[PDB]
Design a protein around this nucleic acid. Sequence first.
RNA 1: GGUGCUGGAAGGUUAAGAGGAGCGCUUAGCGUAAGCGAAGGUGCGAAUUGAAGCCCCAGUAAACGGCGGCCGUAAACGGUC
Length: 52
Amino acid sequence: LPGQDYKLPPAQDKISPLEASEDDILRHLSFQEGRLDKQIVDHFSGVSPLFA
RNA sequence: GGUGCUGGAAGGUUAAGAGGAGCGCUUAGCGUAAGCGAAGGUGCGAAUUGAAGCCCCAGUAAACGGCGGCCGUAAACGGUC
């Protein structure tokens, strides 16, 4: 609304995918049964399913 | 903003009173005719001065008083008179 304070888009609860770590990237996806692309989607910030 | 109250004349409007230009009426006399006419007297009095007040300028609402309409958008914001 005009005049209202900004609230800022919600946090997706991920980690920064770039300049993260060669180890941080895997210590949190936790692949068990094969939802790999969806795990990349909902565990990384701002990534499309096409990139996964 | 308008009206009241208070303050301010830069500029116009200003009455009575001062002021007297000038213009009529009479005639001692100039005049063949019709008119002109000095000094007085008697009416109209133009310019120039002549305050408050009014137009004006500011403040004052626990002074008088007033605090709107249409169209959208989700009280609030946007467009217009």
